[PDB]
Amino acid sequence: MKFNISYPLTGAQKCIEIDDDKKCNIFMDKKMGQEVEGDTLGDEFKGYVFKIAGGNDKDGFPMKQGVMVRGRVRLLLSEGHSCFTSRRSGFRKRKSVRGCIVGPDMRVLALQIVKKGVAEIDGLTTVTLPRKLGPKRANNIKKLFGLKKEDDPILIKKSVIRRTFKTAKGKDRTKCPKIQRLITPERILRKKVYKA
């Protein structure tokens, strides 16, 4: 059983191959998103807690929280479901998917690191992702820099964020986003106009 273990907090994507049978034996007959005690991995995982994130069969078949059945069932999917894409409302489809209960038939189980232990994994703690998109809605902006409500626009205009980068073209540009929600005079003009 291969593991796609993700670490929220940092954004650590790691993959572990666990051949021996005895370890994985704890994931058997456990439901989706349950609390994993990754000590059945005395190795690098000394005192860890995971969440069974999702499933994938030896045939690419994902899991469906809810469909509690240790096997594959075939259902009609409506929008709002997983393993189902739209394209013209009512795209209802008889798509087949893998149960919620984990079984030996499972090829890949994803995991979510809740509480790491004393142990240290390289792929996980070594990361520091510079999430690129800074706030863009007027309100979300101020929420990050402080600035109480009463704060005028012009404040937020120059209080935004910018990004510099070198292009594959050896170019150096400066980019920045618009702030839909910004209270301008135009928005103000229109409202009076309307009530006029």
Added chain:
Amino acid sequence: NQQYLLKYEPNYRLRKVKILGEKPNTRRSFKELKRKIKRTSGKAITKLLSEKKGDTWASVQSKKSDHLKNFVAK
């Protein structure tokens, strides 16, 4: 105004006075890109699009424009 004439006349009348130029075979390839694109996710699509036989309208204009400045007389 040849500057009016240039905006109104049809793209085909212009290549005729040898001002606009060629009329390359779009059909076939465009039909084939539909092929790929209709089967991809945005990621690549963009890339593909960066390969569909030229002749943008944006292109038609710049060429129309050049005949504009560079020409004057009578």
Added chain:
Amino acid sequence: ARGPKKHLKRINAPKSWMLNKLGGIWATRPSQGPHKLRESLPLSVLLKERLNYALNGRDVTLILNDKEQNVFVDGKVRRDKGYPTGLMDVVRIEKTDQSFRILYDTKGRFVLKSLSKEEAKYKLLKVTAKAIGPNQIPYIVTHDSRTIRFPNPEIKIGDTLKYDLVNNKIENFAHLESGNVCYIQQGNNIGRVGIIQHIEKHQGSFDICHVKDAKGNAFATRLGNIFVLGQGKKSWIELPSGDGVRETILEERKRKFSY
């Protein structure tokens, strides 16, 4: 049927458009507007085949899409390939300040009458329905799908109003009663203009009307087809093809080649 039609066939498009039979296969289908399908003239027809200002199809596409605004219908701008210009309308060609009447022939073909900046002001409206609506208020409605607020009360349902487009003001109306002038919007007798004789209502569901005119011809048509072009003999607008009166195939010959 599947849903709602959406096209129109060369062959099937009204003889009022004096259309090109060989033409193509289709024909610009009138857009849902002020006038009914059959009783209308989509702009594309109005400029291409009519005025002839346009020509090829794209010619229009320019005119009505160009950021200059070259077409006006009843003091308003229009940019729809097939706006249904209907009877008694006023169309202005911006770039030339042309003013036209949308009127039928005497042979029933849509004709374009040239107006002077004078008539271009007033347009003739026929009264559709008349009833009181919201919060004790009176409303009148015109064929031209005009909805009127607080209208003069001396107006019966089958009336005809003179409209001052410039001020969106009414003035001098005139109902249909024994002794007036009228234009017939559609029928085996359209394009005619005469004196109303009398209106015999039959209520069973269809009232009729009679008429006289120049050569004192006897005309017969259903009320719904009578449009009061005026009160007591004096017409209110200049008519196309001289006076609204058609000739025997015999009178046409004698007038033209004098046989």
Added chain:
Amino acid sequence: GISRDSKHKRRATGGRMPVHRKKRAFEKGRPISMTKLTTQSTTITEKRRIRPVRVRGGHLKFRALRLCEGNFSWGSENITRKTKILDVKYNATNNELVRTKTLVKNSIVEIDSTPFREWYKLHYGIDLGLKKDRTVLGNKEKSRHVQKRVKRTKAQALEKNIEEQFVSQRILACITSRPGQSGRADGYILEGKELEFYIRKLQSKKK
């Protein structure tokens, strides 16, 4: 596709009748919606339940499945208050609808006199509680209390049947609303012509 096309019938002369058209969607026929009452939550917790159905034009039509309170009007007085309906009796259409306390547009039922009692009291100075204490007025008779009299003297000869009703707490009324269509259940209070009559159906029904 429970349709309602008149094709699956037999023309006047009972000869079978032809078909070339598959059932077409505009002949829609929605699943019936029997309507019960919660005047007995012995099981049924959720008092009233109404589900909205997407109708043709694009509108919604609320469908009454389960209820407990509707609105009713006293013909005579021109009063109308929302009250709690009690038990359904005599459905005319069929007696089974009564057996399942289902709500048909014209199902005769019972209501709480409370709102009407409360009102008849405030406007006439007559509670209608057991007969003896009949009236309840003011101490001084100089001011506005002079009206409860004027009205009360309007020989408020409310039928001997209307009277008994109040005191008993129960009130007779028929409905005037399609629950399966609008989701509500509104009715008029029974009187004269029909009252006397529908009651008879009830007297003889049980006896």
Added chain:
Amino acid sequence: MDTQIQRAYQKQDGVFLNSKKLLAKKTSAGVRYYKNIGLGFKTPKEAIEGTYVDKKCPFTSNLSIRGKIIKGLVISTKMNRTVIIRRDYLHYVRKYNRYEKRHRNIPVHISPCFSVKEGDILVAGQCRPISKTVRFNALQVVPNEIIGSVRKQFLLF
């Protein structure tokens, strides 16, 4: 007690007055729904001072009449307030240049007001569909005498 119950389980009107009328204890209380389809038709005297509750009537209901108006002889009196009128017309035959006889049968609704009889000429109006067949209501009845077979009787009425 008769016109009201008579089997059926109730019979009011379109204008739900009644019991409330006891409020206007002086003028005239006994109101019934009154109407006039017009179209050059008199409203039956009997229709007004009747106790009958026929929703399918053209004088006692919100039942309209529009367009098609008929005159035909009556065939049967059976059925509850519904009758069959038979029309007798000639049909032309292109080739032989002559005619043949033909008869259409019509389902007609009869408000209690006018009194039927078999074999009389009747006048029907075009009212909305009232049932599978019905689509015509009686508006004016003329009594007529035919000594026997109604079928034999064939008149280009």
Added chain:
RNA sequence: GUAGUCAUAUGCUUGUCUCAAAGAUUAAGCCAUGCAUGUCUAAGUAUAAGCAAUUUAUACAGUGAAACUGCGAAUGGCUCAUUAAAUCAGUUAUCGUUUAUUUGAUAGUUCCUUUACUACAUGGUAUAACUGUGGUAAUUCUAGAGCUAAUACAUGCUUAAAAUCUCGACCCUUUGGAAGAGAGUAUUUAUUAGAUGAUGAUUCAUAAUAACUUUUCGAAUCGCAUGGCCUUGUGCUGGCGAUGGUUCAUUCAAAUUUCUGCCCUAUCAACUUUCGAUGGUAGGAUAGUGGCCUACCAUGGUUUCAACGGGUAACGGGAAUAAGGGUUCGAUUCCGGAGAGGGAGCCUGAGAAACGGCUACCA
């Protein structure tokens, strides 16, 4: 007899000119191979040079990548296979039914919490798209990581007091001053209008009217046009459209719907009634008319003018001239119902009996 055959019959095969026909016709033999309804800015979403392609708006230029959108993708087009049925023709308004489309119109009564209404220097979210981490014989696959939008979710006091509606004294003459006169709608019934619109017509409206309705309503628009107003920041000024909503009719419709008409047949005589054969009725469905049904009963009634009924593979049929004649048309069916393996159920929606949406089932 006659030959010819102006009989073919096919049977032999040759400049320049075109109004120019060719697997409906068999089986309504299907998807080889070829192939395939998506989309745009005044306009709603793009990086303070990691869509980024410039270029230096510069607090949001274009410029577009992508997505979000938001739209059509119920259109046709081939298909009688059915179908003797209104199919269809006329021939019905629909007081009996629904309605995008399109306009036209258009909307003061939402508090009044017992205005820290907070204060609208117009809210909240939520997300993509997006960077990425992936998986797998392999998906329109998909996993888990992060992002961010927003004309999308989800909202949301409309103050600056006493809101704003609705009398009007009164003068004070107009600026009217007006006192102090009084105070919104989808969804329900229930009454009253309605004497003082309308119909033949109404229980019609459009009135109200209360109630009482997990019920609405109601531009957290964007676009240029920001120069006039006063203030001097101000207050506006919104202009104008874009972007809405509202209901009505506005065509859009359909959808009924009377009223004439398929081949023969009396060797069709009789027919039709368990729930419909009828009436009539309760309801319920129906979106909404209808026995359409739930009942409930009426016995109905159809019919030699042949009705019951039978039999005709039946899919199925617009122009105009014209003494006379001349001629001719629309164009291989104007018209116009029923198929898109079988079955089922479901799908979109203004709007499908959705063919070419599903599913799931069968094959």
